[PDB]
Amino acid sequence: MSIFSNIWINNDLNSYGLSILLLNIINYLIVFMLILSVILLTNLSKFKSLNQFKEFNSYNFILYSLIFSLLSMAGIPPLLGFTGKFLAILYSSFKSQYLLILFMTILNIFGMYFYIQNLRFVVKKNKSSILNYKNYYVNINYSITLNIILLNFFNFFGILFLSDLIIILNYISSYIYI
Amino acid sequence: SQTFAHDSFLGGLNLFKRRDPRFVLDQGERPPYPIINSNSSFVDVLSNFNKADFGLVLFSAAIGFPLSRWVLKGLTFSSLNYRRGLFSSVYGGVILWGLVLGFNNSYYRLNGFVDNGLVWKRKERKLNKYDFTSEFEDNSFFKKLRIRD
Amino acid sequence: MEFSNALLSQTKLPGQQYDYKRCFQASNTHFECLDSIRDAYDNHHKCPQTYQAWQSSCDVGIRRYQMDNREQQKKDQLLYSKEQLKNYNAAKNKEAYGITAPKNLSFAF
Amino acid sequence: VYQGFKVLRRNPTFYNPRSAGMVALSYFAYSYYVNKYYKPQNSNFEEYNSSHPHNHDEKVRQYHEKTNQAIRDAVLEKRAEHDQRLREEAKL
Amino acid sequence: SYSGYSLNGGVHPCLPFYERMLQCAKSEALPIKMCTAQTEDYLECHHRKKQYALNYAIKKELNNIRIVALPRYDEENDTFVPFSQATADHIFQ
Amino acid sequence: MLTWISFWSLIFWLILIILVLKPKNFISILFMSELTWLALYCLSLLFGAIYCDITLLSISFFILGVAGLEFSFGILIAILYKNLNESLNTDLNNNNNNQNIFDKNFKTPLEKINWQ
Amino acid sequence: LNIDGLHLKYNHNINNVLYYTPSLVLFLIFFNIDYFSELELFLPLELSFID
Amino acid sequence: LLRLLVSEYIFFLPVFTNLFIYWHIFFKNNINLVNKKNNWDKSISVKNIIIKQNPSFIIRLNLLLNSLMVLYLITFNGYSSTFWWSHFKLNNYSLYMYLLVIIFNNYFLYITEKHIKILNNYSIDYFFSIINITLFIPMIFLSNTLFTFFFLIELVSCAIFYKFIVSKISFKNSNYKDNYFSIFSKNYLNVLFYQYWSSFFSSVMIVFCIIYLFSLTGSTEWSIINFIVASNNQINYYTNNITLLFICLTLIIGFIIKLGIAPIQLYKIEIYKGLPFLSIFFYTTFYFLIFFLFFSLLFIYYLSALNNFFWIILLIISIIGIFYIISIIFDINLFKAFLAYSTIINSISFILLIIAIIF
Amino acid sequence: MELNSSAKEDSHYVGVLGYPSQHDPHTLHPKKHDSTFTKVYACRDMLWDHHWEVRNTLYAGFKGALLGVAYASGFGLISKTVPSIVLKKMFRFVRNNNFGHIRIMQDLLTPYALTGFGLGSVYYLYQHNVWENRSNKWLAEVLSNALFFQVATAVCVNPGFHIYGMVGGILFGTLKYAFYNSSFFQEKESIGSYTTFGDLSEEERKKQEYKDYIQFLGNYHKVRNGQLVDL
Ligand SMILES: CCCCCCCCCCCCCCCCCC(=O)OC[C@H](COP(=O)([O-])OCC(O)COP(=O)([O-])OC[C@@H](COC(=O)CCCCCCCCCCCCCCCCC)OC(=O)CCCCCCCCCCCCCCCCC)OC(=O)CCCCCCCCCCCCCCCCC
Ligand SMILES: CCCCCCCCCCCCCCCCCC(=O)OC[C@H](COP(=O)([O-])OCC(O)COP(=O)([O-])OC[C@@H](COC(=O)CCCCCCCCCCCCCCCCC)OC(=O)CCCCCCCCCCCCCCCCC)OC(=O)CCCCCCCCCCCCCCCCC
Ligand SMILES: CCCCCCCCCCCCCCCCCC(=O)OC[C@H](COP(=O)([O-])OCC(O)COP(=O)([O-])OC[C@@H](COC(=O)CCCCCCCCCCCCCCCCC)OC(=O)CCCCCCCCCCCCCCCCC)OC(=O)CCCCCCCCCCCCCCCCC
Ligand SMILES: CCCCCCCCCCCCCCCCCC(=O)OC[C@H](COP(=O)([O-])OCC[N+](C)(C)C)OC(=O)CCCCCCCCCCCCCCCCC
Ligand SMILES: CCCCCCCCCCCCCCCCCC(=O)OC[C@H](COP(=O)([O-])OCC[N+](C)(C)C)OC(=O)CCCCCCCCCCCCCCCCC
Ligand SMILES: CCCCCCCCCCCCCCCCCC(=O)OC[C@H](COP(=O)([O-])OCC[N+](C)(C)C)OC(=O)CCCCCCCCCCCCCCCCC
Ligand SMILES: CCCCCCCCCCCCCCCCCC(=O)OC[C@H](COP(=O)([O-])OCC[N+](C)(C)C)OC(=O)CCCCCCCCCCCCCCCCC
Ligand SMILES: CCCCCCCCCCCCCCCCCC(=O)OC[C@H](COP(=O)([O-])OCC[N+](C)(C)C)OC(=O)CCCCCCCCCCCCCCCCC
Ligand SMILES: CCCCCCCCCCCCCCCCCC(=O)OC[C@H](COP(=O)(O)OCCN)OC(=O)CCCCCCCCCCCCCCCCC
């Protein structure tokens, strides 16, 4: 907001923090959906303790899907959760909140280790058998695998297409007159 | 020329042709078409029914058969009577949704939101200052889904 | 939202209703007279009868929105033109395919 | 009370008279404290509309009042002048 | 919401002030600053803070020793007669 | 001694304090929750009378209905305690030592820890 | 449930002295939402006339 | 009342239609097993009285009606204003929130249908409760007053309690050692107890806040509340900072107890421990996409005029929660606890972002 | 809600606006003709005098004591476990003495109240006599709070937690600089506001503002780099 002979100039978009908040919520929901789809594809009774993360030590698709989902939740740069965290920090800097940035970073790093430590448990002595048996054979669901694959693609390459999602979220939030 | 005639059986396809991606107009913005009845009650909205609304109902009836069967395909441990009853319930629900869409279309035509066959005497014309879609629509299939003054 | 004119105009009394047909007819008549006058600043007193009809028919919030929209339209008309905007948008869309490389070793500032 | 004595033998007055008295005394003291000291302090009516208020809150309130009055007067005067000018220009 | 009804189905006593405030808010381009009068009138009719302040001041003044005897009210003529004057309806007589 | 507004405003939170304070027996907590709903009922009626607000007056039956539904759910949960083998006194459902209880004492279901 | 009426043997004094008495004291000291409501007998009833 | 405009209730027709269809089909399914065989009727095969119907058809019905509601929204038209006595707001942002909630619910229902086809451990009542939640939860963003918001959230809370009640308890597993011994599991009671009491606390506090908001401002509409608060700041008429701060505290604490944010989190951990994976799958979606989003909009959009009080409360809550969980999040040993604490950490981060936004 | 409103006040801005200033003396001046009781009662302005070091120290001590009592009421006493025999003896005292709860509360809250009073007084004296006129305010707050809380955690809680005390003190100093010595959510001025002095004509002011706008245009990257399409 600048005044030059009673002419106001606004280089700030007020309906931007709300868009960033929506983006963070959507990114967390997407990553949560990815991990929960991986869980639902398998047998649910196996996973009952943090130690049981080793039970995810199954064929490459499930194993690496879990690994990348955990990393994305932690906030590792290339993955989806990093976009939300980075944009939150960027908006905090734009609003000039150094203390908020400090506390966000403390929480982020503590939560990052909280997510990462499970990768230690993911290691298993042998390959786990977590699939339900149907017709005497393990039941692998093509539909859930396809959904997990789309989620994996977007988790890996969200940064490339994030501009369109940001445009859409800002468009949605601009209707709010705040 | 861009919208189907409101009095035809295909006049219900104008619901998908919108000038801007907004949901509702601002409080004070003139509707695109002349207003026929701003304070419309249930009886007059029903009286304003048209071949377009009948066509919407027919579309709902035609599309509710594949959808009803699709819903029924997830049914197990069911007798023939219950399966037929469930199909009837789903089909009736889809047809009722078609009736609701027809009622909404009639309401929109009364309020001028969709093409009601009338045009304002003096058009309020915009200046297309920001244009990311004119060339795209002209060279693509989406020119049919948008209405331009 | 306390500062939002649109949200405040969306408010209403429990029994209040708007006759949009009548309000828009009156507003169209008044704005046609104003356009016939064709002045830089809308002087409603130059159209007394239509101004009174417009005030009676339309609500305060609707009138506020209409006047703001008219001001924006006047500014846009003074600034741009249809052909100018068409050419500018075409040029900008054509440019969007290329890249914007930095200009190193500038001369200004 | 039918069989009033048999009914009132156990608890004629109170089950724990000492605790009842403590409750009464606490209620009395708290009501006194609130009404006499706490609520009047929050209301802040002692210096209300005083011509020479010694309280910062009252001074701020009077400043708000006078500033709003001045704003309303100035805007009314400016709007009257603007309307007069428009009316004069209309008849030309 | 503000229904605008009273406790017997009538009209809420604040309805005129509420209508004025809403009209001003809709009309003004700066409703917060340009509707102070109407909004304060509505808030006064709703909360009655000013009357409570007046009552507090009057209680303090009554506690102070300034008033001895108010004039009697002659209801037949709808007039006020000084307490000193004797009347048939006077309590002391 | 106290104005009704201040009295009811205070006693609502006092009732909540009593609910938290009393030993956690599901039936007792249910009764205290009902009392809290009724305190809200009385407070809403008081404010409705003060401000001539039919909405505040009408909140009475809404509060009554919500309280009735919650009481029904509480009855069902209290009955379900039996099938789930839980003492209504929740403090007895854990082995944590509590000085507030005179006779809390649990042992492993054994007869002798040492055999040889 | 609990037909005999026998209840848990609970001593409220411990919590009363440890947490509840001081917390209630602080809450009572710092809690008053009534802004300017006036008690009856605050002013003579003869001043009120609207009723 | 002389004329009842269709504008006051146009938006209610699709939701009423969906409600009618859902409940009619639910009753028919409930009475499905009743099929009399007349003495002259001939049976081609012997009737199988034992039946366990897969809920895939219920899930598909929910998907179909959600898609129809999406179609209604896409074709929707009207003026931006309030309808039905100014209790519901109809504007672009509110409608977009409604549409976003519906779309996410549709996608989650699609994934759930695939999972149910994989394996069936969920009854028809489970997905009927999900149907009710999906039908009634997006209506929250159309709320125009705190009163209607409270009633809608109460209805959604009852639906979620129904969903938790209909959780499957006993499984047919491969453990043959407990046939003649009593095994005690308290997860069901713990979930019900904590959910019920959290709902009670949140509801009472929100009702208290509603009463005091009515006292402060003659109405409880968002626009009127904000306008009155701003004008009060301008005039300096009503200056009971204690009352304003207490109203803000009651509202924030009610929402804290409702959501289960770091200061009050252990009950959320217990609920997650006792819930099935699919229940968590739906509950996290509902929570983040509606409850937490509306909690954020309370400070951003609805009660924006009170941000002069909300900022300090939010900061204190965030600091206390961070310093309280920094150690707890490393003390858990359960998958459900991990999921719940992931949600809690993200909630705290979003609260910090909300503070930054309201700045 | 503001923290330390008086300290962070723009005297010049409030003076030009006419807004009442919190720096006003706020003192009573009884007349020489006034009653003796009035003269004695007018002495209470020493309780408002903010330059009285003894008054400020007692004020800080009262704040610390109240904080300690609140901590005891909330967390300290409930976490600490008292011996059963001690509890029985004190309950017997309550039974045998009227208002025994008051004396029990006094006994239980004496340690917390006294330590809080000591901490408050020492902290006020420390911050006032030292660090009050340093150059880097943020650094002064951080270092002072770090040292003070390190010593406090070493003494009150445990000598083995002094590093955590120091880290918490650094965090508290940053927080205090953010929201106590600075006005982030307590703004009393509009961003970009100013005051005009000197006899400059409106035409001259408009000309200077036009020049300022021309300079401001250079901020935009597109205009500075000459990367704009011809409109
Ligand atoms: C059959 C598929 C055939 C695909 C052929 C290639 C076509 C493109 C891919 C299309 C795939 C569509 C369907 C999704 C499949 C994948 C998900 C899945 O579930 O698969 C299951 C499926 C079967 O299950 P499975 O194999 O048992 O499961 C194993 C797991 O999936 C674990 O497997 P993994 O460990 O190998 O997974 C890859 C791993 C690690 O993968 C990587 O690191 C990717 C490295 C790509 C090579 C180039 C990198 C260059 C980076 C330079 C710096 C750029 C900075 C830019 C600034 C922002 C930051 C990026 O994880 C990540 O990707 C996370 C890190 C992402 C880093 C972001 C890099 C962005 C680069 C953007 C392109 C730049 C192009 C510049 C040149 C052109 C200029 C005009 O998996 C596979 O068959 C293998 C998938 C492996 C990844 C495939 C893509 C790698 C090659 C990409 C080449 C093109 C560039 C990228 C852009 C593409 C368009 C947006
Ligand atoms: C940068 C961060 C980005 C984060 C992104 C986060 C999300 C990423 C993952 C999810 C993305 C959506 C994936 C598609 C839906 C899932 C189901 C599916 O299609 O696969 C089943 C189906 C598999 O077929 P099948 O294996 O032969 O048979 C399966 C069964 O046996 C037999 O199948 P059935 O008979 O049981 O079911 C048949 C039905 C099953 O599919 C379904 O029923 C759809 C279920 C999802 C419903 C919600 C979709 C919402 C889309 C809008 C954007 C939001 C996406 C949010 C997604 C997460 C929500 C939690 O199939 C379809 O019809 C597929 C149509 C999918 C497109 C629907 C578009 C709806 C648009 C509505 C809004 C329009 C704008 C309104 C504006 C209003 C303004 C006033 O899919 C396919 O046939 C093609 C698969 C391979 C191509 C997939 C291409 C996906 C493209 C996604 C574009 C996302 C937006 C653009 C990018 C945005 C970021 C830059
Ligand atoms: C309005 C709501 C409350 C109404 C009353 C209660 C009824 C409703 C109950 C439901 C509400 C929740 C109750 C939760 C109870 C929690 C457990 C408990 O403590 O009770 C169990 C307790 C034991 O139950 P039990 O085993 O059945 O009975 C055994 C014995 O027979 C029992 O006999 P005992 O003698 O052993 O017990 C006596 C009991 C009850 O207390 C009494 O005996 C009466 C005390 C009256 C107040 C005396 C203080 C002075 C008041 C001045 C007021 C005017 C100020 C004007 C200022 C003007 C400024 C310009 O003693 C206490 O509670 C201990 C604290 C009492 C002193 C509070 C001092 C507050 C101010 C402190 C300021 C800081 C001072 C710093 C040092 C200064 C040095 C110079 O129950 C009872 O004795 C009956 C209930 C009593 C509840 C009292 C709750 C505390 C509030 C006291 C009044 C606060 C006034 C604040 C404003 C004035 C400030 C100056
Ligand atoms: C979160 C919860 C869900 C969302 C929120 C819930 C919203 C709740 C509030 C909804 C208010 C809706 C009010 C609509 C009132 C107007 C209705 C209408 O259009 O009437 C037009 C017509 C009148 O149209 P009109 O208004 O044009 O008529 C007057 C015309 N002039 C003035 C010109 C003379 O109404 C009627 O004639 C009938 C009135 C109702 C009669 C009684 C119906 C009872 C039905 C009971 C249930 C039956 C179930 C059957 C099931 C069968 C299969 C199993
Ligand atoms: C309408 C029905 C009428 C008929 C009812 C039946 C009438 C006959 C029976 C009545 C008494 C019940 C039977 C008692 C048998 C046991 C006798 C006994 O132990 O003593 C009884 C009681 C004993 O009470 P207590 O102190 O033991 O009570 C505690 C009880 N336990 C032990 C169980 C905890 O005698 C008295 O208390 C007498 C002294 C106090 C009296 C009350 C004073 C305060 C209230 C009145 C105030 C009056 C005005 C003055 C105050 C200022 C006013 C401004
Ligand atoms: C110039 C003249 C022009 C004249 C044009 C006249 C035609 C106008 C109408 C065109 C309709 C085009 C197709 C519409 C979609 C048909 C969907 C269908 O049948 O799928 C059945 C299918 C049923 O499945 P299925 O039949 O594909 O087979 C299922 C097989 N298994 C199960 C084994 C996989 O429906 C679905 O699966 C959808 C489930 C979710 C619900 C989605 C509801 C969508 C509602 C769309 C309404 C119509 C919108 C039209 C928009 C027009 C815009 C211009
Ligand atoms: C998120 C960011 C985290 C920031 C981390 C902050 C680090 C905190 C470190 C705390 C150290 C313990 C408290 C030190 C208190 C004394 C500080 C002081 O005197 O400086 C004030 C004076 C006041 O300075 P000033 O404010 O007048 O001038 C500031 C100058 N500029 C602007 C250039 C920065 O500052 C200094 O002279 C030192 C500044 C740097 C800090 C040096 C700390 C030395 C600590 C060891 C002292 C050893 C003493 C002798 C014993 C040696 C061993 C036997
Ligand atoms: C209350 C007041 C204090 C508040 C402090 C708030 C700020 C805290 C800042 C923390 C920064 C580190 C973030 C990651 C936290 C990881 C938590 C965790 O669980 O880790 C466990 C692990 C250690 O546990 P582990 O992996 O060995 O556990 C093995 C399993 N058990 C324990 C069961 C046997 O921590 C780490 O891996 C290290 C974390 C990163 C450390 C980065 C470098 C140090 C950063 C701090 C500065 C120190 C400067 C010292 C200078 C000395 C000069 C002489
Ligand atoms: C009709 C239309 C429809 C509505 C129907 C309404 C139905 C109402 C049903 C009422 C049932 C009454 C009988 C049951 C309760 C009897 C009281 C009781 O149980 O007391 C419990 C509790 C106090 O218990 P405790 O402290 O142990 O001491 C007992 C001393 N009574 O009690 C308390 O908390 C306080 C008890 C107060 C007792 C007061 C006794 C006064 C006696 C007056 C005698 C006559 C003189 C009156 C003078 C008046 C002057 C103004």
Give a description of the structure.
- The PDB classes it as electron transport.
- Keywords: Ciliate, complex-I, supercomplex, electron transport.
- Cryo-EM structure of NADH:ubiquinone oxidoreductase (complex-I) from respiratory supercomplex of Tetrahymena thermophila.
- This is part of a larger assembly, with nine protein chains of nine kinds.
- Chain A is mainly alpha-helical and 178 residues long.
- Chain A has helices spanning 17-41, 60-74, 80-94, 98-122, 142-174; strands spanning 2-3, 8-9, 133-134, 137-138.
- In chain F, 23% of the residues are buried.
- The longest helix of chain F has 31 residues, at 54-84.
- Chain F has 116 residues and is an all-alpha fold.
- Chain F has helices spanning 4-21, 26-51, 54-84.
- Chain G has 51 residues and is mainly alpha-helical.
- Chain G starts with 12 loop residues before the first helix and ends in a 21-residue tail after the last helix.
- Classes of the chains: A mainly alpha (178), B mainly alpha (149), C mainly alpha (109), D mainly alpha (92), E mainly alpha (93), F mainly alpha (116), G mainly alpha (51), H mainly alpha (359), I mainly alpha (231).
- The structure holds cardiolipin (3 copies), 1,2-diacyl-SN-glycero-3-phosphocholine (5 copies) and 1,2-Distearoyl-sn-glycerophosphoethanolamine (3PE).
- Residues 1, 4-5, 8-15, 17 of chain D line the site of one 1,2-diacyl-SN-glycero-3-phosphocholine.
Structure summarized in a few sentences:
The structure is cut from a larger assembly and holds nine protein chains of nine kinds. Chain F contains three helices and no strands.
Keywords:
part of a larger assembly; 9 chains; D: 92 residues; mainly alpha; 3 helices; 73% helix; E: 93 residues; two-stranded antiparallel sheet; 4 helices; 2 strands; 47% helix; binds cardiolipin; binds 1,2-diacyl-SN-glycero-3-phosphocholine; binds 1,2-Distearoyl-sn-glycerophosphoethanolamine; Ymf62 (chain G); Ymf65 (chain H)
